[PDB]
Amino acid sequence: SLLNVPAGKDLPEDIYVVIEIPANADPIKYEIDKESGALFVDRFMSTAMFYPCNYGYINHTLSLDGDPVDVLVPTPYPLQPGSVTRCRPVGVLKMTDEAGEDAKLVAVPHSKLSKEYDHIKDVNDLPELLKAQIAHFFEHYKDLEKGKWVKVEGWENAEAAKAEIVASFERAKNK
Amino acid sequence: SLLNVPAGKDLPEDIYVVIEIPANADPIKYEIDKESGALFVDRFMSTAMFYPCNYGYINHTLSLDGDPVDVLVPTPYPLQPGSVTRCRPVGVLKMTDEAGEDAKLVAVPHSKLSKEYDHIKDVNDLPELLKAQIAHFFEHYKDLEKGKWVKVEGWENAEAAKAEIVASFERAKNK
Amino acid sequence: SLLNVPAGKDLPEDIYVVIEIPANADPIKYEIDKESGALFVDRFMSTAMFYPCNYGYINHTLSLDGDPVDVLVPTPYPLQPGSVTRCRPVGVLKMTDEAGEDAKLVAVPHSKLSKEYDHIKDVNDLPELLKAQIAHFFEHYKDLEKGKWVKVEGWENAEAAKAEIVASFERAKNK
Amino acid sequence: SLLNVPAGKDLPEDIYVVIEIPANADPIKYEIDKESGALFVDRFMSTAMFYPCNYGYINHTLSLDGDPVDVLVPTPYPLQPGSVTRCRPVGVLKMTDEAGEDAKLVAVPHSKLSKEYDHIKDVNDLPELLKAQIAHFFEHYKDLEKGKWVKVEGWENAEAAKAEIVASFERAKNK
Amino acid sequence: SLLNVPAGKDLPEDIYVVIEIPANADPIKYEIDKESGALFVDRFMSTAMFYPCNYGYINHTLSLDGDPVDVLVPTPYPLQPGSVTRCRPVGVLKMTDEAGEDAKLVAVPHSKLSKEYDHIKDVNDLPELLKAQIAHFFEHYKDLEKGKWVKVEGWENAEAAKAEIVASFERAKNK
Amino acid sequence: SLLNVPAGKDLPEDIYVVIEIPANADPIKYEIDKESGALFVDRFMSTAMFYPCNYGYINHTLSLDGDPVDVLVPTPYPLQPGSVTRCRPVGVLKMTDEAGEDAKLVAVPHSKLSKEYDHIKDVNDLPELLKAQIAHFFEHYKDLEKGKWVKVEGWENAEAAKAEIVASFERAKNK
Ligand SMILES: [Cl-]
Ligand SMILES: [Cl-]
Ligand SMILES: [Cl-]
Ligand SMILES: [Cl-]
Ligand SMILES: [Cl-]
Ligand SMILES: [Cl-]
Ligand SMILES: [Cl-]
Ligand SMILES: [Cl-]
Ligand SMILES: [Cl-]
Ligand SMILES: [Cl-]
Ligand SMILES: [Cl-]
Ligand SMILES: [Cl-]
Ligand SMILES: [Cl-]
Ligand SMILES: [Cl-]
Ligand SMILES: [Cl-]
Ligand SMILES: [Cl-]
Ligand SMILES: [Cl-]
Ligand SMILES: [Cl-]
Ligand SMILES: [F-]
Ligand SMILES: [F-]
Ligand SMILES: [F-]
Ligand SMILES: [F-]
Ligand SMILES: [F-]
Ligand SMILES: [F-]
Ligand SMILES: [Mn+2]
Ligand SMILES: [Mn+2]
Ligand SMILES: [Mn+2]
Ligand SMILES: [Mn+2]
Ligand SMILES: [Mn+2]
Ligand SMILES: [Mn+2]
Ligand SMILES: [Mn+2]
Ligand SMILES: [Mn+2]
Ligand SMILES: [Mn+2]
Ligand SMILES: [Mn+2]
Ligand SMILES: [Mn+2]
Ligand SMILES: [Mn+2]
Ligand SMILES: [Mn+2]
Ligand SMILES: [Mn+2]
Ligand SMILES: [Mn+2]
Ligand SMILES: [Mn+2]
Ligand SMILES: [Mn+2]
Ligand SMILES: [Mn+2]
Ligand SMILES: [Mn+2]
Ligand SMILES: [Mn+2]
Ligand SMILES: [Mn+2]
Ligand SMILES: [Mn+2]
Ligand SMILES: [Mn+2]
Ligand SMILES: [Mn+2]
Ligand SMILES: [Mn+2]
Ligand SMILES: [Mn+2]
Ligand SMILES: [Mn+2]
Ligand SMILES: [Mn+2]
Ligand SMILES: [Mn+2]
Ligand SMILES: [Mn+2]
Ligand code: NA
Ligand code: NA
Ligand code: NA
Ligand code: NA
Ligand code: NA
Ligand code: NA
Ligand code: NA
Ligand code: NA
Ligand code: NA
Ligand code: NA
Ligand code: NA
Ligand code: NA
User: What is the rounded distance in angstroms from the CA atom of residue E127 to the CA atom of residue A128?
Assistant: First the structure.
C-alpha cells in the first residue's frame, strides 16, 4: 500500500510525496489512514477555499502535530488523491496550528518528471502570487471551524525546508 | 442578447438573474459587458476562494457601485455563465466595497423550476453554514488585490432584499 | 443571436441544431428563450437521469408542443449549451407529452464536421443500446414531476425524420 | 488495503463507509474486489441514470445478496471511489434484487466531519425529493439489463437501519 | 453580440480576444459564425491533441485565411467559449495553412486582469516548453484530416505580433 | 493491492487490465510502482496529446521494455486510475520504443460488463479513426522528450494480440 512508499530516494534533496488533496479541488479534506493506508475523509472544510497546490505528505516522517510532514506540490495539472510524486524541496511556510508546529513544505516535481520546475531552485524563485495565496489559505481556511486555528510564522528557504525534512524523518525514527 | 432580459416577471417577488460565475468554479471573475452583452473576464481573482453559490445580477437595475444589483443563487448543480434563472428573493447581505454600497441578494430558484427551495421563505431558513461561507467569502476574496476591499454590514431579511431590488430598479430607471 | 441561425443549409437533409443541454450533464433543463435568445433554466429535473445525447432544436421550426422541433445529436464529446452543430437526420422517436405531439429527431454530425457518423444512414444503423437508452429516458425522466408525462410511440426512419423536419418548418412559416 | 477498514468505531451508530461510486457520476458501476481490495468495473450500466448519493458499503458485513451491506452517503461534494467516510445511519430503503434481499442504508457524514447533517436525525428529516430520487433510481436503473431486477419494499427509519447494520455484521461473523 | 466587441481599447498594445476553444479541452473545434455571432462546431478534430492555451480571435480583423486573426491566450484556468479577455501581445508563431497565411499570436492577460503575466514582455519570456508545445500542436493537429495542412515558419517577437495585429485590422477595414 | 490482481480469469481470451491513465485526460503519465502497488507520476508528458483510450497493463506479465504488457481499453466513460476492468483482446499495435519492443494491445470490455463491444471481434472491427488516432498518438507523444522515441511497426489481429499476451505472461513466469 501507500503505507510502504519510501520517504524518498535520497532525502532530503530527492523525496516522494503522497498526495491526499488535488490543487483547486472541492473542499474535501482527505487524509491517509496510518492503519489501513486508505484515504479517509477527515472533514468537509467550512470555508469557500481550495488548496493552491496539490497537498500531501512525506511517508515515514512525523511532525509535531503527530502526522507526517506536510507538502504542497505545484504541478501543471492536478494530481489524483493517493498517487505519489517524486519531488525536490524549494521552500517552507513555517506555521503552527491547534495540533502543534506544522510546517508546510513546498516541493516541485523532480527534473526527471518534468523540466518545467528546474528553474525553481529556492524560495525566492516561487511566484510571489502563489506564495501569497498559500499563506492566505493557511491563515483563513480554518476560520469557520471552531477549535481549529493557525499562526503563520513565515516563508523560509530550501535549506530550511531540507532541515525540516531531516528532522521529521528522524522523529518518526526515534518515537 | 442578455441585454434584453427583463428584470423579472413580477418584481420584486419574481425576478430573473443573469448568471456570470458558477458556484464552486475556478477563480475567473466574469462580468457581462453592458455594451455588447458579452461575457468579459473582469479579472483572475488572487485568493484561493470560490463563490459559494452561482453569482450574477438582475438586468435593468443599478447599484451604487454603478453595476446592476448582485445576486447569489443556490442551486443543486452549478449554472452556465450567461444563462438566466427565475428566482425569489429570500435575504440580503449588506456590504460596501471600493466601488460603493454593494449589497448581495440571495434568491432561490422559483417554485416552477424546482420545489427544493420552496421551504426557504426568509433569511433565517437559509442554512447557517451557507450564510457564514458567503460572509466569509466577501470578507476575504479581495484580500490579495490592492485597492479592492469590502466592509460587510450584515444579513437582512426577504423584505429588505425586496426593498433593495425595487430601489435598484428605480435607480436604473431615473439615471 | 441564436435567434438568427437558419434552420439549415439544405433542409431537411442538411440542418443546424442549436444545443441546449449537453450529453451526460447535470439535470439542468435549459431552454432558449424566444424573445431574448438567452439560455434560461426551464427547471431542475427531478429524476436522477441524464440526456443520452446532446439535446436541442432546429431554429425556425414549430412542433405541436409550441416549441421548435427537438433534436438529439450524438457526438464524441459533449457540446456547449448555446452552440450550433451542422447535422444530418437519421431517425425519429415518435412521442407525445403534456404539451402536444413532441417527436425527438436524431441527427448526426455532418460529414464535414466528422467522418465518424457517415456510416449511420438510417435508424437501424444507430446502436441498439443508444436507441433503448433514449426511449427509456423519455419514458421516465418526468416520473417525479406531477402534470408532466410522456407517451412514447416508437422509432421511425430517416425519411420519417425528414418529413417531420419539413412539417415543423412549414408550421413556423404559416402560424 | 481497504480490506482492513473496520466496519466502524461504534456500530451501528458510528460506522465507516467505503465508497465505490460517486454521486452524479458516469454510469460505471465499480465494486471492490474482496480478494485483492481493488476497484473493479462490475459493469457499465445501461440506463441513462446516476446514483443520487455516493454509494458503497460497510466493510466486514454481509447482506443476503452475498455482498457487504450497501450504503448511500449524501455529501456536499462527490467522493473519490475507494475513499472511506465516517457516518451515522438515518434510514433505509428496503428492497430485493436478483441476488437476494438487498437493503440500501442511508448514512450521513458524522458530526466530526461536518455539522451540515447533524439536523438529520431520522428518515423523515431527509429531503422528500432525495428519498423519491433514490427509490426511483433503484426501481429503474436495471430496466435495460436482462436478468437484473429490483422490488423496492419501502422506506424505514434510523432504528431499522441500525438493526440491518447489526444483522449484516453478525452475518459476516457467522458464515 | 460578440459581433460588436471592439478589436481593442488601444490596438495593437491593448486588445480584446474572443475565445472559441478553451485550453486543454475536448477536441471540438468551435468557430464563431460571422453572420449570427453564434458558436458553431467547425469540426471534431481527428488527432488526440488539445490546444495548449485558450484559442480565439481579435474581432474586426482579417487574416489571409479569410478569418479574423488568431490568438492563443495563456491563463491560469481555462476560459469559457464565447467569453472575451483583455490582453497584451507578446509574440507570434508565423505559419501557413490550407486557407492562407495564418499567424498565431500569443497575447497574455492584461495587467488589469492579473499581474501574473506582467513579467512576460516579449517572446523570449514565454516558457520554452509552452512555445514548443504550441509549434508541435500546429505541426500535427491536422495530420489525420486530408486536405488540411500546416507549414510552421517560426517564432517572432512582440513587435512582429503588433505589426500583424495592425495589418489584420487594416485588412478588415479595406476589403 | 493491485499487486495481487490475476492476469486474467482465462488468459489470453479473458483478461484483467489495471488502468493507469484514463482516456482523454490531462497529460500526467501515471505508472503503478511494482514494489508498493501505488500509482506514481512517471512524468508530465511534454506534447499537447491525450491517450485515445484508457491505458494500463496486464498484471503478472512482462514485455521487453521490462514492464507488464501494455493495454488500451476503449470504454463509454473514462475509467479511474488504479481500477481494474475485465476485457477481451481484439488487436495489437506493434511498436518499439527506447526501452525495448513494446506492443500496445487493444482489449474491449468483456460482454459481462457491457454488450456494447461484443460486435468487435477482431482488429478490422475497430473504428478506422480510433486506430489511426492511437498510431498517431504513439508516433508523436514522445516528440518533445529527448531520449524517448517510438517506431510504430503496425496493426495486427486478435490472434497476434493473444500470442503477445501468452508470451508476456510466460516471460514474467521464467525471469
Ligand atoms: Cl524511507
Ligand atoms: Cl494545517
Ligand atoms: Cl507570502
Ligand atoms: Cl424589466
Ligand atoms: Cl463585490
Ligand atoms: Cl453570517
Ligand atoms: Cl431558415
Ligand atoms: Cl420532451
Ligand atoms: Cl428502443
Ligand atoms: Cl470491524
Ligand atoms: Cl442493487
Ligand atoms: Cl420515496
Ligand atoms: Cl474596433
Ligand atoms: Cl490553424
Ligand atoms: Cl518552438
Ligand atoms: Cl495470474
Ligand atoms: Cl510507450
Ligand atoms: Cl492506423
Ligand atoms: F498533518
Ligand atoms: F457589480
Ligand atoms: F420543445
Ligand atoms: F452489494
Ligand atoms: F481562423
Ligand atoms: F510499460
Ligand atoms: Mn473548488
Ligand atoms: Mn489534520
Ligand atoms: Mn498532513
Ligand atoms: Mn495542520
Ligand atoms: Mn500537519
Ligand atoms: Mn475552485
Ligand atoms: Mn466588479
Ligand atoms: Mn455585479
Ligand atoms: Mn463589488
Ligand atoms: Mn456589485
Ligand atoms: Mn449527470
Ligand atoms: Mn419544455
Ligand atoms: Mn424543445
Ligand atoms: Mn417535451
Ligand atoms: Mn418539444
Ligand atoms: Mn452522469
Ligand atoms: Mn453487484
Ligand atoms: Mn454492494
Ligand atoms: Mn444489488
Ligand atoms: Mn448489495
Ligand atoms: Mn483533451
Ligand atoms: Mn478554420
Ligand atoms: Mn480563427
Ligand atoms: Mn487555420
Ligand atoms: Mn486562422
Ligand atoms: Mn487533455
Ligand atoms: Mn514508462
Ligand atoms: Mn506500461
Ligand atoms: Mn513504452
Ligand atoms: Mn511498455
Ligand atoms: Na476544481
Ligand atoms: Na477556527
Ligand atoms: Na469546481
Ligand atoms: Na485588497
Ligand atoms: Na457529467
Ligand atoms: Na409526471
Ligand atoms: Na457528473
Ligand atoms: Na432488467
Ligand atoms: Na480537459
Ligand atoms: Na492533413
Ligand atoms: Na479531459
Ligand atoms: Na523524443
Answer: 17
